[PDB]
Amino acid sequence: KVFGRCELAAAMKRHGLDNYRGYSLGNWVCAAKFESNFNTQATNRNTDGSTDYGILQINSRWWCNDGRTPGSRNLCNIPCSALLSSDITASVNCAKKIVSDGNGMNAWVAWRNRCKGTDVQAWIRGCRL
Numbered sequence: 001k002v003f004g005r006c007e008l009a010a011a012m013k014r015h016g017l018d019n020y021r022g023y024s025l026g027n028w029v030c031a032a033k034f035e036s037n038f039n040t041q042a043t044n045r046n047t048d049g050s051t052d053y054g055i056l057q058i059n060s061r062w063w064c065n066d067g068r069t070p071g072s073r074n075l076c077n078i079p080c081s082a083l084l085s086s087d088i089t090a091s092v093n094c095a096k097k098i099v100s101d102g103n104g105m106n107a108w109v110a111w112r113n114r115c116k117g118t119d120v121q122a123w124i125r126g127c128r129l
């Protein structure tokens with residue numbers, strides 16, 4: 001599923017990501033934009049053999065099981081495939097664990113490089129939320 005901008009903002013708010021660990025909704029929308037262009041089916045192979053999945057490009061080294069990442073963990077206790085669903089529940093629940101891990105949203109390198117410090121509210125501007 002490719003979400004619209006306000007459509008994803010609303011879904012993220014419904015699942016309790018708005019101001020989760022102090023990160024406003026615009027932060028999450030921005031991160032999704034640059035991770036996946038709002039596409040739940042986005043996948044990206046890493047040089048290390050891990051793969052990133054879904055709207056927030058969650059990695060198989062730590063967070064989900066894909067059966068092909070040697071030595072990895074599955075801290076969110078999910079098959080990585082659940083991260084590709086039109087239902088963002090599994091993506092959101094897993095992102096809450098990731099953002100709680102110590103480094104906040106810096107866990108998403110694209111958030112640090114493209115969203116951090118910017119006018120992230122622009123991402124929810126205009127939306128009925």
Ligand SMILES: [Cl-]
Nearest residue numbers: 004005033038
């Ligand atoms: Cl957009």
Ligand SMILES: [Cl-]
Nearest residue numbers: 024025026121
């Ligand atoms: Cl915001």
Ligand SMILES: [Cl-]
Nearest residue numbers: 065066067068
């Ligand atoms: Cl497996």
Ligand SMILES: [Cl-]
Nearest residue numbers: 067068069070
């Ligand atoms: Cl594995």
Ligand SMILES: [Cl-]
Nearest residue numbers: 072073074075
């Ligand atoms: Cl594990």
Ligand SMILES: [Cl-]
Nearest residue numbers: 065078079080
């Ligand atoms: Cl599994």
Ligand SMILES: [Cl-]
Nearest residue numbers: 011086087088
């Ligand atoms: Cl959803």
Ligand SMILES: [Cl-]
Nearest residue numbers: 021103104105
């Ligand atoms: Cl933080």
Ligand code: NA
Nearest residue numbers: 054055056057
């Ligand atoms: Na994701």
Ligand code: NA
Nearest residue numbers: 060064072073
């Ligand atoms: Na894994």
Ligand code: NA
Nearest residue numbers: 087088090091
């Ligand atoms: Na999901």
Ligand code: NA
Nearest residue numbers: 034113114115
């Ligand atoms: Na950018």
